[PDB]
């Protein structure tokens with residue numbers, strides 16, 4: 536299938552060499568593509584220390600040469616993309632092209648060689664003013680002068696290089712901070728131009744608000760369903776998976792142009808710790824919900840080894856090392872495969888017997904996914920289109936039966952279920 540049809544593994548902070556070595560496992564996990572952290576040169580602050588708390592330096596470019604101390608060299612990136620292809624895995628690169636580091640003295644002469652390359656570092660003030668949001672600085676990070684056709688070619692050359700090194704797609708960091716052709720009199724052809732590459736798949740991080748212009752960006756790339764992420768999280772928090780709150784994407788953009796998640800690296804690693812509270816079960820459950828969906832493209836966030844239950848960085852690994860083994864959890868991968876096999880099937884979300892603690896998604900008449908957010912097991916008995924027969928839970932222990940259109944079986948507490956003919 537295409538990248539848009541499958542699931543994506545966010546290999547957050549995974550070095551190029553780490554990725555290359557876990558490639559067979561990534562494949563067996565049912566992922567169609569992996570997303571790396573920024574691969575360009577950055578300001579390796581705090582003396583380049585690899586403590587997981589230093590994750591943010593990767594978002595402070597100093598040049599657009601490929602390679603850095605956190606992820607590895609440009610050669611290792613290439614080898615990584617090659618090892619990925621040996622398994623049909625696509626590679627999506629996190630492109631930070633809206634800004635550079637805040638430290639002007641760290642910026643490379645290479646960048647400074649570009650005449651009038653920056654809008655300055657005047658921090659945004661009015662997040663309701665498309666002018667201030669796009670033309671000024673985010674957190675003090677020098678804002679690229681994207682209206683300058685010369686910066687465009689410099690940045691696009693970087694993207695083209697990545698594609699030549701084996702990259703297959705992009706994730707445009709802070710995409711909401713780069714003007715569109717119709718943003719008043721300060722608009723540019725930045726997006727029309729840079730999205731014109733051989734990239735197979737590309738989406739932009741556009742966190743939603745009154746001025747994010749979600750639908751506008753969708754014309755040039757897929758977009759993030761940030762609101763939906765909060766909808767899911769709230770559901771997980773209250774152990775209430777009622778479909779009246781988690782079926783709508785809370786966005787004007789339709790599923791087919793949406794990239795979804797249970798949590799993002801931002802909601803997890805920032806000092807706000809807004810999603811850090813979740814446990815692995817909360818993730819197995821949330822992932823069952825979003826990854827069972829039709830159209831949208833789910834992004835699985837790989838957490839730091841030992842991370843969760845409110846603790847961001849427990850110190851059991853550092854930047855570069857692989858994340859926890861949840862990305863290849865039986866429940867998680869079973870759902871990945873379900874997502875892949877059902878591609879093209881319609882969907883039907885519900886809450887069996889009116890119990891909102893039970894999520895159910897029936898895709899066409901080929902497969903069903905159940906999610907029990909409650910702390911007690913539930914003997915299900917609901918309508919289904921699956922052909923009569925016995926179905927072993929692919930996501931875990933247990934089995935179910937389908938007789939005369941009746942789906943019966945027990946779904947353990949805090950558990951996921953995935954059923955469909957072999």
Ligand SMILES: [Ca+2]
Pocket residue numbers: 633668669670671678679712713714
């Ligand atoms: Ca900008």
Ligand SMILES: [Ca+2]
Pocket residue numbers: 616620624625626701702703
């Ligand atoms: Ca490739």
Ligand SMILES: [Ca+2]
Pocket residue numbers: 808811845846847
């Ligand atoms: Ca904490």
